[PDB]
Design a protein around this nucleic acid. Structure first.
Ligand code: IHP
Ligand code: IHP
Ligand code: MG
Ligand code: ZN
Ligand code: ZN
Lengths: 442, 384
RNA sequence: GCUCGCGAUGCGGAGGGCUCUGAUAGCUACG
């Protein structure tokens, strides 16, 4: 009992009413108090719970961190307890992504603030709390309906929020690249550097953390949250929808589940193939779950299930980031999922709104985040790049797939990841129709 | 005592009611507080002496999707008639073990060896189902009110919507038809917030009228069992009930032998039950003959107030299935198909029941009545 | 006999907010 333990420890300590959003199948409250001179916070869909979590927050931070059920504890990464406590890092990133979402959604009064899933990327450069900035923000829980896949890179295949956040992260990564390889006055203030091995690398101590308001679909969610206490298969998403099915073993096309995709990023990096031709691989340092966190299942699904992996290409590893949930977890909303996806990256004017079921925008235009637009920015970068900084002999490219193919080493990493999955008995990844990349900027 | 069917109905009504009172110390315990009551009653002879209450249950709710057990430990559906059947299953297992103890005890079982394999019921034993009301979906949705003679019967028997399969839906009112033919559920979807679909009680009883009431696991031992009559405490509409129970799928064909489309007696009672004023309780009570006390389960969690699993969850039933499996002569089995000892797979071992269920789903689909909606599979992937 | 669209009056499981009662338990204050 949070309220009871705190008001038995401390004197009579009443509070006041702060926030009131929605009603019925959607409502939200937030409470704050001052205990021993503090300003703690608590969020919940009814008043008694908002304050109760504010109480457990105040207690854990002030006297000693709360002792809870064990599966709700976070596993520290292979390296890094530097970002203060891991749980405090989670609270920080979560509040940051919520705050920027509030900014983009005219402070939650916009109709797009109704979201079933919220995702975000956060960049940090220094252990001090000030040195932290929200890179991108996104929403979405649906996928392109197979009937509307546009082949020439004009449709978004996957608008689950965490996917959209990674794609905005790439949109930010290219911009930092042009910052470095633009007017060289931008080279001092940049996240990039020429690599100590030939090519491009990130500056030391600049990290990225991933936030999802919930556990990613697929393997990291397949568990009973009210019975914490051997299968890790790959799963594919269901037609234009939330929820995943496992793959058969060794008729419409499937998109891989979000747990599977997060694994892939934990092996071959978040930058993808084209970016690999230029930058050294980049790995998320932490994963923050708004809700539905179970340390065991999350760890299984993110990297542990493919610990049978070997033959790590030069500069690749099985990335084992920090896993953690947030202190004040979100709660389940029964009901249908929106048909839209919201994306925003740092430096952007406004949010962008895509219809998740068509992958083209609310008006019918392709996205600032689809294959075609990303290729054009990649071509911009290939133009003004010194011809010797490239990592493979990517000679002036003509087609999206082939340019992707020039990332021989990235592709080696993909090969060994698929090997790890089949050798583990978890099934065979579902590769997209290859023709979905057979276009140029023509 | 040869009787008009109306006396049979009033009798079973009386019986289930009195048993409920006895368990609730004359309806005075707070566990008497119920909106709906169901019961099973067994007969062995036409005389009133030859009638015994097999089980008693109450309830009007189903589980929150956040609380589904990946280890067979939570009850999905506590509508009363669902729960009463599960109590029947517990008595069924007990009677198997009563036969398999020794031949002085096997004389007093309701089972006997079948001349076709496994066990069969002794002749002159039949089961009757009592619901104090109409079962949700097709038998109820169109007129959930006591009809008055002024208003005869259904003025629109041919609307598309008559006879459709329907689901209960998490945090939603009503029983919904199955749209776009169907949309299978997922585990990580329902966790996200996809509302959990559960087939309606009208549908489930239809299903029991084709594949029998024993489920698949029990089919591995027993021949199929059918309710001989269905008795309604209130809200009885003969045309809708008969449509809902069997007639909507009287197109069913090529069923395994000893499977059939069962058309039980349908009847309401002389003095209908009356509405229970109050909030609907969120809890369900269960009892089988031979039980010490009632069990009280929170329907929205499907576990008991302390958090314990039910003597009725998938897991407890699997355990009773294994106990009987041990004592069964490996040649007395009705299916010799072997399966690893996990709940889902074991059920697959019931090839003939599965065939029947396939014919049931096909009958509904070819009738335009929709496609059955199953739960996410991850809830049957458990062992002991 | 029905289907579909738009209305209209109703019928029939979630969330929230405020009051009433009893009880359990932790705390004070007073005589
Ligand atoms: O964010 P996503 O939608 O998951 O995008 C990825 C990405 O495609 P794009 O880069 O064109 O957006 C992958 O390419 P890389 O990032 O590795 O360069 C691609 O995999 P391949 O290019 O290796 O084919 C994969 O598609 P799939 O894994 O199904 O082939 C595809 O995800 P979707 O196809 O699910 O959109
Ligand atoms: O109607 P209920 O009392 O809820 O239980 C039934 C029963 O499941 P269990 O008896 O295994 O608990 C059916 O299984 P059988 O008796 O036929 O073996 C099962 O159907 P399947 O096992 O054929 O999948 C059905 O589940 P479903 O409705 O998904 O087909 C399930 O009912 P609920 O899922 O509604 O709880
Ligand atoms: Mg099923
Ligand atoms: Zn997803
Ligand atoms: Zn029902």
């Amino acid at each position: 009992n949070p309220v009871m333990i705190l008001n038995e420890l401390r004197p009579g300590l009443k509070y006041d009413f702060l926030s009131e959003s929605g009603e019925s199948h959607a409502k939200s409250f937030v409470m704050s108090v001052v205990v021993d001179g503090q300003f703690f916070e608590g969020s919940g869909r009814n008043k008694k719970l908002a304050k109760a979590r504010a109480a457990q927050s105040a207690l854990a931070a002030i006297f000693n961190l709360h002792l809870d059920q064990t599966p709700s504890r976070q596993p520290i990464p292979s390296e890094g307890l530097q970002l203060h406590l891991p749980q405090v890092l989670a609270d920080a990133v979560s509040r940051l992504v919520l705050g920027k979402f509030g900014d983009l959604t005219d402070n939650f009064s916009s109709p797009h603030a109704r979201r079933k899933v919220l995702a975000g990327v956060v960049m940090t450069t220094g252990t001090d709390v000030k040195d932290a900035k929200v890179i991108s923000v996104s929403t979405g829980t649906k996928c392109i309906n197979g009937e509307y896949m546009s082949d020439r890179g004009l449709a978004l295949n996957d608008c689950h929020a965490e996917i959209i956040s990674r794609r905005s992260l790439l949109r930010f990564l290219y911009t930092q690249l042009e910052l470095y390889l633009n007017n060289k006055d931008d080279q001092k203030r940049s996240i990039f550097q020429k690599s100590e091995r030939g090519g491009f690398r990130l500056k030391e101590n600049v990290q990225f953390h991933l936030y999802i308001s919930t556990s990613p679909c697929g393997d990291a969610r397949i568990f009973s949250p009210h019975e914490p206490i051997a299968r890790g298969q790959l799963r594919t998403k269901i037609e234009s929808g939330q929820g995943t099915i496992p793959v058969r073993s060794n008729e419409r096309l499937l998109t891989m589940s979000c747990s599977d995709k997060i694994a892939r990023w934990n092996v071959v990096g978040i930058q993808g193939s084209l970016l690999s031709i230029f930058v050294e691989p980049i790995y998320f340092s932490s994963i923050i779950l708004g809700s539905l966190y179970h340390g065991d299942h999350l760890s299984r699904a993110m990297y542990q299930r493919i610990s049978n992996i070997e033959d790590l290409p030069p500069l690749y590893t099985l990335n084992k980031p920090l896993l953690s949930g947030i202190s004040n977890a979100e709660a389940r909303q029964p009901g249908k999922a929106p048909n839209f996806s919201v994306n925003w990256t740092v430096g952007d004017s406004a949010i962008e709104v895509i219809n998740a079921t068509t992958g083209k925008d609310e008006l019918g235009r392709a996205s600032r985040l689809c294959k075609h637009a990303l290729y054009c920015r990649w071509m911009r970068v290939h133009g003004k790049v010194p011809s010797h900084l490239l990592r493979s002999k990517i000679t002036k490219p003509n087609v999206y797939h082939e340019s992707k193919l020039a990332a021989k080493e990235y592709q080696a990493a993909k090969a060994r990841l698929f090997t790890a999955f089949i050798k583990a008995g978890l099934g065979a990844w579902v590769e997209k129709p290859t023709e979905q990349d057979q276009f140029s900027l023509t």
